Amino acid sequence: KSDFKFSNLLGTVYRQGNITFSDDGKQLLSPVGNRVSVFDLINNKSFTFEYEHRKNIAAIDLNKQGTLLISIDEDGRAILVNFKARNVLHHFNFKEKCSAVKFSPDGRLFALASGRFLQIWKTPDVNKDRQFAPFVRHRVHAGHFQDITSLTWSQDSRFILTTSKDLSAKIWSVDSEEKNLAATTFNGHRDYVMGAFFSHDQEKIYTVSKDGAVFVWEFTKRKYSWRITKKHFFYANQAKVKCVTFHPATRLLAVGFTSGEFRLYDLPDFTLIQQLSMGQNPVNTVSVNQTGEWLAFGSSKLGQLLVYEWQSESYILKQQGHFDSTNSLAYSPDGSRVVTASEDGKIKVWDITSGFCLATFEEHTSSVTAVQFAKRGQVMFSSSLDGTVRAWDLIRYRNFRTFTGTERIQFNCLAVDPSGEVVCAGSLDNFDIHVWSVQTGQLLDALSGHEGPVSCLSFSQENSVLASASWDKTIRIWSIFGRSQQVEPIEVYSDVLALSMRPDGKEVAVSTLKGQISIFNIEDAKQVGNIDCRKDIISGRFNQDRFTAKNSERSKFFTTIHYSFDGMAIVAGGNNNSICLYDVPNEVLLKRFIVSRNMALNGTLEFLNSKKMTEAGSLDLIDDAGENSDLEDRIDNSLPGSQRGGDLSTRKMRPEVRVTSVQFSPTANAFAAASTEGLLIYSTNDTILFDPFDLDVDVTPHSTVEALREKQFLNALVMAFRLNEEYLINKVYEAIPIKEIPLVASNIPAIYLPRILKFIGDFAIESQHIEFNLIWIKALLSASGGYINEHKYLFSTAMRSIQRFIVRVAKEVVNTTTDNKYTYRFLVSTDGSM
Template identity: 25%
Template structure:
């Protein structure tokens, strides 16, 4: 006809001061509700375009608002962690449903999980910790963490052969179980100088402090027994005599002191050095103390008189960086700032051999128990070298290309290096640096054990009896913790070659399931920590794995967009579920074992009928679905998404029922308590929120029916 069509008519509802996040018509179409970042909800008259009422009361952005119960109520959700119910008839706020915010983590929460009795909740975080919470009070019970916060710089093996101690600039000393690799005890406020020694009976720990004191601790009880004051600068080196009668200490100004260990009395000031004391040691007979200094000398002191043995001074051309006494006190090895390592005959005070490592400062020297090998740690080149003491020749090992190489090269392995020592009781070498210590086979240079904190804690789960907690980390390991003591009891490591994404106990508590980016899911004996089975899925990342309610099956979810069901005993594939268009983040079983729910990066969740394969797609999120869970009666399901919301769904119809929008960032995890009274959400904002579902049931029964 040639006549231009008229532009579509529209009506503007103006009144909000900030962006509008959601809008919804009432059932009769006469009114509209809107939620805004101006912290308000408005009710509008469609005919007049005017706001009938503004609902004020939220303390932060209102993300969503919806009509409930045949148009009688409005439910609003805000970033202030509150749900509010409003009566439309009289425009009054009926009730505030405030989620209890659990805020102690300093980085994103990646997983939340209730204990089987519903009394505890655990949160796993990117801040490398897991925290258990009392659900009734919202207060933290235990923080599950171990290892140094930063800069571990020294270590010593306990003479019992079962433990070792590490000291760090983080003002702590940690005692580790060598066999399990777990932290046995920690001593706080030990000073930042990281100077330590242990008595021959493994009962006493001596530490030197930047607070100018020497502290003596009971290793068994952790009690501080004595504090020895007298230094006027940082205590940089400490030692305890073989008979435990004396302690020797040196400081940053070059002063050395000899103490009565039991009374704490200062016996002698060992005067002679003019610069920092870098090492101090008793000879095995307990009658002589050697002190190494930045003034280019090693001093020798008579314990009884405190006088220096002038004819036994070991003179160097430059500052001494480290010292090791060996061969029953007959020899010593020193590293010097001139780059050389010298072997000394302590009887003649003469050099018997000189060794020249690679360029750089040798920060530590150590000699093997058989007195045949020397170990040097070059902190500048980050290289560990082994030497034959008899010939002075370097003992190299074959590299990947067949060429010989230094014993350990941290430039290739990554990580810091500060100290290396031989183990006196194992065929191994301990290296210290960064946040950890690592034990290596002294022949093959393969890592035997690591003593370090978790990396990012991605997942956590309670055992069925609540006595144990398992955590999985992006450091490729899992740890089993005692929930009463908060101590790690066992490590599950060196089996995965990628991030551990999920950890779960079997229903009977006898097995632990881990899934990893290395394309495997592994089943472990929960008591021994031994691996029982590995479920292989090459060329993909396994993001989630879960036992069936009866423990007979396992379902894994992976980046290849599939769910795979396995026989938990035989390890055979039983069934594959396909339907997602993007990688799957998480999978969960229904409590009756008949359904699965999966969340995907395609922004959807799918409920699967296991027997028939029927799919119900839950569509509504605007970003990847990170977590999924069924309600205890299986009639509802919650999904958590990177879009900052958690949504409640009817599992039969697939209809969305409720949206929680209180987190400031993506919601990473959601879980129901066993009785359905609580829902917990965890977020990238570092907070977990506990929601009381009974409030939703009482106030909006047709919206949330969690308990039948």
């Protein structure tokens, strides 16, 4: 149950820092703010590392063996991670702002640019155990005068080429014996050297600067002493160079400028191979594959990530996230993609397993407040601040209905009928609940009776009653259908935000501004029980506020809650950085998760460092934005009293940490929470956490495989269930033969039935034994499918992942073979004569 680990981070493909490819250019490592996401683009799946920096990260590398990673944030706090175990080895604090870190090609060293010092360290072994201090220093080189902007190793790990903000670029040798091979600096530039690269045979050096020159350096005579033989210029006037890379095997210089435009050149010739644009924001990052066939770009401002093959001109992916803007989320009816409604006005359908956005929808002129699915995965209704509830058909990707009121008010919550006849939506400035029909697009009625803004709505999925809840401390139950027109008010203690309905529609749990969760029966409208939830909340102290976190009244309540799909738990979160999940029958806290440990966000620390408080204000309230290098981020475009508007540059304050919507997954034991860093996705995996179920002294792994070898298959399977080890359940499940699948499946006891159903679900999504798993499913449903029917909500998140296996892999396979059957029949039954 309650041992949810951090699994994934949907949204925000890229935030800040350098993009890296793997050695086999399959995965790309992209910095989300303090995490690191790894997208495998071939096996279409993705994860996010569980470790966390205290600030937004700025530099990334992993060595060519793919075996260990090092990530540095924007004040030098590096973290070294064992890659294939996903578990952090060491934390090392370089003391100052590190521009780039880079491993060696041969792997044994790395080198990083900390200010004006190039410092070369030697890599620890992955198979050596942990030490107190595994990093051994090779050298620290100081030749530069201002900060270093880049590193480039040679092909053989012998020389290292650093580019400085001071207008030169130096070449350094690794060992002391070749000091006289690398003693030259490369002057001649007008602005910041943004890159310095070797050619393939290391007999040319190309040095590209900020203003748009690229110099070619060769070892000739006018002895031989590293002349510059040629200068090429990009001639981009208002734009200037932001990130360069060079793949020397295929001779490819990729440059990304400060106007979105990337041009890529073939370098000793300097011929424009291609030139196009990511967008309008500057291109902060370029990286190239190891074969040089893929290029990955990143623009930090809208947070967008490209990888683009350039031989074929075709975007491998062109994605874009959302920082500090997600007003809601909703899982699909098969919990395979999350639909996210975001403040810049758009809906995005994020695939979960591969972390990329499938479709996006922008027909709202202003911010979208709420998204909710309907008609079982066909339509998706969304209500917005421009005064529209509009329906989206996810089959033809169209907006087929737009519902407006006659009053032009901005809707802040919506709720759809089960059989999607009726859509209701409630505002934060009108006190009515607008009820439109979906077939005829008209306004069916307007339910009045609240005396405060309708904060949250829901429709009961079974008996179709409408539970609304508003800031007049009142929840209110409307029987709309069938001659009644009945209203039932329930008073509560303080003003309700976040109502959620039980899955079977018997009960409804509200959150209140006291920070309590009150669970009401609907039919006899009494309080079945409350949870006191204001002391188990982590409310941080902001940098600008003058009152402690113990005394702050800002975020000690939950503004969004969701029941579990069996109806026994509640996940909840708000404008604080703790998401808490409770179980309702005992009314106790199961677990409380910290949504972020970033200090670049605001409401994180409860206790701020008193070294930053000075004799005039904190030191994180001084705007050091006039010390910036260039005008486009020296500009202060933050018009004054703006909270939650648009465009994060127009706010002047650090982004607060907050959760706007939580959801339990309809198929597999997970929840998702829409934080500011992204859609945090938490789930339990059962490869770890030995959690047996009434075993005894004689039930063992060896005893299970002995009963399997002496082929009592029912005994072996229920011994595997009692151990509750997933590899044992898998091993016995594949050792049972097909003739006595239906005997075993009829004789599994009634308590181990949801175990085998959820195992077959989360196994058969990915495993290749399609006919075996459908044999098991047919045996189990024919054997005990009356028990499932009458214990519906027990098997409601296990049977719903079974028909995420049937309709999404098995029915697709059947569609392909049915196409082959009818093409065969037509191609051999007719007459193609002349």
